[PDB]
Design a protein around this ligand. Structure first.
Ligand SMILES: CC(C)CCC[C@@H](C)[C@H]1CC[C@H]2[C@@H]3CC=C4C[C@@H](O)CC[C@]4(C)[C@H]3CC[C@]12C
Ligand SMILES: CC(C)CCC[C@@H](C)[C@H]1CC[C@H]2[C@@H]3CC=C4C[C@@H](O)CC[C@]4(C)[C@H]3CC[C@]12C
Ligand SMILES: CC(C)CCC[C@@H](C)[C@H]1CC[C@H]2[C@@H]3CC=C4C[C@@H](O)CC[C@]4(C)[C@H]3CC[C@]12C
Ligand SMILES: CC(C)CCC[C@@H](C)[C@H]1CC[C@H]2[C@@H]3CC=C4C[C@@H](O)CC[C@]4(C)[C@H]3CC[C@]12C
Ligand SMILES: CC(C)CCC[C@@H](C)[C@H]1CC[C@H]2[C@@H]3CC=C4C[C@@H](O)CC[C@]4(C)[C@H]3CC[C@]12C
Ligand SMILES: CCCCCCCCCCCCCCCC(=O)O
Ligand SMILES: CCCCCCCCCCCCCCCC(=O)O
Ligand SMILES: NCCc1c[nH]c2ccc(O)cc12
Lengths: 238, 57, 294, 128, 338
């Protein structure tokens, strides 16, 4: 059969072309680290996106650090039901969870953020996905604590018994109350993340501002640490 | 508010659904059995075909 | 006593079984095949199997019989194969350590792309060919025996026993250069790479420990792993190479028993390697579990 | 059909005590973690407390722990919330919420605006 | 005034329940006691398709029973020749987060969609020789979960906005909108005659929709958890659904109630996809436990297991002729069983 053999030859040529294209696409894809950006509507997620850049369902931003390409996806124009479409981001390098640390009292959105973080951490499909916890709006939190408007003592009764960890490294000129509140908020999420105790994924809290210029560097460092920890665990080093 | 309109729409939908004709479950089971038996002779997955007949060999 | 054949045979069988298990686990597990890193372990397993199938049995025959009926040509061929495969295994270990160091410290974010097929092919070629320049090329031409021929005749025949036995004599330049190429430079590279790995792992573990203490309901793992690996490698190879360096300077007065013990300690490395780089890897653990379950 | 209903409510003076009952049917109660959420007039839905499948693990929001108590009975297929020492701000419709899937620790969308596996709740008013 | 309507609604629900109970003269299991069991069913991998970089989430079989379209979250919508394994096409999607794909009955067009809120239609045999987006369908406010072609011009799409819509490809407008679902709609299934389609949703209910009338004719609430998959019985008088329940259930349109439930103690994970054989005797469902369990539609027993996947099985499909069944999974490989 000559016609059949010619058809198979044409199909094989098309297959080879498609395989070459897919090899190039695989090469470019492996060089990219995908990230998922999540947070409350009132959080500084939009400000962070604008800073990094400087009604589609997914918004993507292109940014490169140390000649390393990163794809950050902002889930917009989506309903509040996350238990289904969140599964699509199981293979992302990390999930950047932005929390308004100052929203402890403004309904207390901090509790909702903590519950969302717990749900993300305990998801079956996200067990291998690290979370980059950005405790945003630090300036507002410090201003409210200093001004006396803060009432976290009763919103979170564990605050009274809580004390500043010795490992804390407050910035110069930082009021002790501000440091205590910041580290209490951080430990609130660390309790949820540390509870698993599996080592497959880790949380990387950071005290960041809405217009902070180091957010890109923090993300790069978090991704590098995640990859290093994954490699170490693979070789039984962690 | 839209809540009352949604409730009215749901009630109307329930009314429309309720007034449908329904057959006995036994008749549906018999129809399913007849369909399965009639087409059981043309289901390669149900009964494996000879290796030569299967194009994947 | 002749009972020693049981120990040698058991070691050979264990090494062969470990290498075959590693190879079949890599092949069976489609997840392992697609990873470029796993190829280095496959090459190391192949080298260890070659050692256990073309070096160890001949050595066991030599010791148990104390006779060499295959002639000088086959004595030289055996010695060349032994040196080739030993240096290949050592180079495979060194390159595995270097690849791990690269992936962890150097370019973790673009490690998957940097390990192009060309890089893997070049590193495996370096592992398999460089040994040829020191194992076959010098030994076949007898460059290791020039200047020490009269010494060779002294140990060639213990006329109390008429049996002739194959020997491997190394002169000062050949001994020094081959030892430096095969063990010392690779050993230093492994030491540096594993020290950097230890530093990185210690830093990561310290961060993890601080976070865990902060989040408590109220670091030694990497050190242990690296210590085990390096201790195994040292106890396997370092005594033999130290003896090789020092033996020529002491008029080759080292007793044959010590040389034999160190040589077999070197051979045991091929049998331990399957249980080190596969047992201490999560993917290899999963592959072995699947293979056992079948 | 997954159906959740609540009982109890009405006017209660500040500092009083009240008990909520959540009647569940149409699904295996023991295999789903239950949650209580409330929506005050003009405000969004706020999570109150959760109860594990076996009830061994219990947690409450910062402003509710100790004051309230959540309990479940897998035999009668009912969930309870002992509301003790009600504050004036506690006035809200308390919804008996079920987690979306069984055997899963994650309970994402209990506080969602249009969740489907929620109990509709009873109005609670705290005033003199 | 709100409460007065709710008494009416509860009375209607009770009346529907009573009618369904009255119509339940006998169960399918009881009548099915004296039929010949199917027996052991064995299937192993026949063709392994490789080339996808990320997890596969959806697939569909062509009418010719030879071409296969697979959707991966890496941005590639590859078309495979099952008989020869050759990759006919490799379409680079605009958005990498694709959650659905569909093959037109004539094979002239291919549709796909996902988190991008847009269902892209691709022409495979343009006179220019290349593959290009014929038209993009926009208007949804959620995530596209499933889509199926009624014809080369009409396509039914499901979205995460809890509404399904019928689209006219030529004009790109919504012919009709379905808004009866309260939860997230996850899957669609077209009847053999294309007159009606059933859509499963996260509200643990399945609704039968009339394409032309733009309404749900019936509603089913057998499942207790989110429904992820739905598939019509080959005759079109019944359908099966997959859910997080870890169990499969069968419903009949005429009976308007559940007939059979497929469950087993060792199965506790969710169900991703469900499909029926040509005769409908075998019910094949994909599970999150990395293997697919073959269930007898009548005997309510497991006939076979397809454990050739190393990750979550996200999609399942049976050829029109029923010769083979192709299953996709998160491991980035497609397995064809026979
Ligand atoms: C199962 C597959 C994927 C494993 C691939 C690993 C590669 C690196 C392995 C598999 C077979 C190996 C080859 C087997 C045979 C020899 C002959 C020897 O004199 C030199 C090395 C050489 C040439 C090996 C090189 C490395 C090799 C090619
Ligand atoms: C576990 C071992 C025994 C597996 C078999 C190893 C094979 C390769 C070994 C075992 C015996 C060996 C042979 C022994 C005798 C000689 C004679 C010599 O003049 C040429 C090589 C030759 C012909 C050897 C070739 C390699 C050989 C065949
Ligand atoms: C990585 C490469 C450089 C490794 C190869 C090193 C080669 C060049 C080394 C290893 C052993 C060395 C030989 C060892 C013995 C002697 C005897 C001396 O009287 C003349 C040089 C000569 C013959 C050396 C020549 C160079 C040599 C062959
Ligand atoms: C052939 C002979 C010389 C080889 C002997 C191996 C020696 C060099 C090895 C064995 C144990 C090693 C030490 C083990 C770990 C430590 C701790 C830290 O401080 C890094 C270096 C140091 C101190 C190593 C130095 C090198 C070392 C001492
Ligand atoms: C990594 C190294 C340092 C580990 C230690 C290896 C030791 C056991 C080796 C290195 C040098 C070796 C010595 C070298 C010289 C001789 C002289 C000989 O007439 C008796 C054995 C003796 C005394 C050897 C004994 C074993 C020895 C001490
Ligand atoms: C003399 C030493 C030569 C070394 C050659 C190294 C070859 C590198 C191979 C890289 C992985 C190849 C994977 C495919 C294997 C196969 O063809 O079955
Ligand atoms: C082997 C070369 C690289 C270095 C890797 C091994 C480093 C050894 C460190 C020795 C000190 C270990 C102290 C552990 C204390 C503890 O158990 O908490
Ligand atoms: N069995 C040790 C073979 C070997 C490999 N490399 C060497 C270097 C020098 C030496 O004498 C011997 C060797």
């Amino acid at each position: 059969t000559e016609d059949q053999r010619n058809e198979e030859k044409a199909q094989r040529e098309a297959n080879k072309k498609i395989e070459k294209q897919l090899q190039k696409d695989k090469q470019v894809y492996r060089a990219t680290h995908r990230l998922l950006l999540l947070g409350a509507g009132e959080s500084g997620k939009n400000t962070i996106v604008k800073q990094m850049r400087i009604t589609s369902g997914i918004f993507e931003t292109k940014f490169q650090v140390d000649k390393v390409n990163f794809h950050m996806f902002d889930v917009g124009a989506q309903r509040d039901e996350r238990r289904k479409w969140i599964q699509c981001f199981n293979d992302v390098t990390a999930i950047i969870f932005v929390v308004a640390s100052s929203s402890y009292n403004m309904t207390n959105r901090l509790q909702a953020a903590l519950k969302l973080f717990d749900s993300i951490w305990n998801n079956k499909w996200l067990r291998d996905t690290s979370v980059i916890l950005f405790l945003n709006k630090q300036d507002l939190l410090a201003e409210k604590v200093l001004a006396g408007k803060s009432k976290i003592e009763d919103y979170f009764p564990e605050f009274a018994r809580y004390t500043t960890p010795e490992d804390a490294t407050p910035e110069p000129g930082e009021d002790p109350r501000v440091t205590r509140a910041k580290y209490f908020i951080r430990d609130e999420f660390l309790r949820i993340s540390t509870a698993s105790g599996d080592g497959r994924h880790y949380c990387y809290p950071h005290f960041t501002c809405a217009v902070d210029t180091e957010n890109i560097r923090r993300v790069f460092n978090d991704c590098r640490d995640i990859i290093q920890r994954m490699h170490l665990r693979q070789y039984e080093l962690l | 508010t839209a809540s009352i309109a949604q409730a009215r729409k749901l009630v109307e939908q329930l009314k429309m659904e309720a007034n449908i004709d329904r057959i006995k479950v036994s008749k549906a089971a018999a129809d399913l059995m007849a369909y399965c038996e009639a087409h059981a002779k043309e289901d390669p997955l149900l009964t494996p075909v000879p290796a030569s007949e299967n194009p994947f060999r | 006593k002749v009972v020693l054949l049981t120990f040698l045979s058991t070691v050979i069988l264990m090494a062969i079984l470990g290498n075959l298990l590693v190879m079949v686990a890599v092949c069976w597990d489609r997840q392992l095949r697609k990873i470029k890193t796993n190829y280095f372990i496959v090459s190391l397993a192949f080298a260890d199997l070659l050692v256990s199938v073309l070096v160890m049995p001949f050595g066991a025959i030599e010791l148990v019989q104390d006779i060499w009926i295959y002639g000088e040509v086959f004595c030289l061929v055996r010695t060349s194969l032994d040196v080739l495969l030993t240096t290949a295994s050592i180079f495979h270990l060194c390159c595995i350590s270097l690849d791990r160091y690269y992936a962890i410290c150097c370019q973790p974010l673009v490690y998957r792309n940097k390990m192009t097929p060309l890089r893997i092919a070049l590193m495996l070629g370096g592992c398999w060919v460089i040994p040829t320049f020191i194992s076959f090329l010098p030994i076949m031409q007898g460059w290791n025996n020039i200047g020490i021929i009269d010494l060779i005749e002294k140990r060639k025949f213990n006329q109390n026993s008429n049996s002739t036995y194959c020997v491997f004599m190394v002169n000062k330049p050949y001994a020094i250069t081959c030892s430096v190429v095969a063990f010392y430079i690779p050993f230093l590279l492994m030491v540096l790479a594993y020290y950097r790995i230890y530093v990185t792992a210690k830093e990561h573990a310290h961060q993890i420990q601080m976070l865990q203490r902060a989040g408590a309901s109220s670091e030694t793992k990497a050190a242990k792993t690296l210590c085990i690996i390096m201790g195994c490698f040292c106890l396997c190879w370092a005594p033999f190479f130290v003896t090789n360096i020092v033996d020529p300077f002491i008029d080759y007065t080292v007793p044959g028993q010590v040389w034999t013990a160190f040589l077999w300690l070197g051979y045991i490395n091929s049998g331990l390697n399957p249980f080190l780089y596969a047992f201490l890897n999560k993917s290899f653990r999963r592959a072995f579990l699947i293979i056992l379950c079948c | 059909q997954v159906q959740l209903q609540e009982s109890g409510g009405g006017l209660v003076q500040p500092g009083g005590s009240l008990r909520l009952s959540c009647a569940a049917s149409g699904f295996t109660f023991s295999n789903y973690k239950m949650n209580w959420v409330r929506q005050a007039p003009g405000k969004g839905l706020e999570w109150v407390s959760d109860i594990s499948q076996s009830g061994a693990s219990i947690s409450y929001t910062g402003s509710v722990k100790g004051r309230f108590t959540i309990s479940r009975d897998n035999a009668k297929n009912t969930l309870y919330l002992q509301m003790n020492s009600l504050k004036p701000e506690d006035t809200a419709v308390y919804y008996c919420a079920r987690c979306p899937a069984p055997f899963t620790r994650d309970c994402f969308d209990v506080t969602s605006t249009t969740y489907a596996y929620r109990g509709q709740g009873t109005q609670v008013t705290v005033s003199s | 005034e709100l409460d007065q309507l709710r008494q009416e609604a509860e009375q209607l629900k009770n009346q529907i329940r009573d009618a369904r109970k009255a119509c339940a003269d006998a169960t399918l299991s009881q009548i099915t006691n004296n039929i010949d069991p199917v027996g052991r069913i064995q299937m192993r991998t026949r063709r392994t398709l490789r080339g996808h970089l990320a997890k596969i989430y959806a697939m569909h079989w062509g009418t010719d029973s030879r071409l296969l379209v697979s959707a991966s979250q890496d941005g590639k919508l590859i078309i495979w020749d099952s008989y020869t394994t050759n990759k006919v096409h490799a379409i680079p999607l605009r958005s990498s987060w694709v959650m659905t794909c569909a093959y037109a009955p004539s094979g002239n067009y291919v549709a796909c969609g996902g988190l991008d809120n847009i269902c892209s239609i691709y022409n495979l045999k343009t006179r220019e020789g290349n593959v290009r987006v014929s038209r993009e369908l926009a208007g949804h406010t959620g995530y596209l979960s499933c889509c199926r072609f009624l014809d080369d011009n009409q396509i039914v799409t499901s979205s995460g906005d809890t509404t399904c819509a019928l689209w006219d490809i030529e004009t790109g407008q919504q012919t009709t909108t379905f808004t009866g679902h309260t939860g997230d709609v996850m899957s669609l299934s077209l009847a053999p005659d294309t007159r009606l389609f059933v859509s499963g949703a996260c509200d643990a209910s399945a609704k039968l929709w009339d394409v032309r009338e733009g309404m749900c004719r019936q509603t089913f609430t057998g499942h207790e958890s989110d429904i992820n998959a739905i598939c019509f019985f080959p005759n079109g008088n019944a359908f099966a659904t997959g859910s997080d329940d870890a169990t499969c259930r069968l419903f009949d349109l005429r009976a308007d109630q559940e007939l059979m439930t497929y469950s087993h103690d060792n199965i506790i994970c969710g169900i991703t996809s469900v499909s029926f054989s040509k005769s409908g005797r075998l019910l094949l469902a994909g599970y999150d436990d990395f293997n697919c369990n073959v269930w007898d539609a009548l005997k309510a027993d497991r006939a076979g297991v397809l454990a050739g996947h190393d990750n979550r099985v996200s999609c399942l499909g049976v050829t029109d002729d029923g010769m083979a069944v192709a299953t996709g999974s998160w491991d980035s490989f497609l397995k064809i069983w026979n």
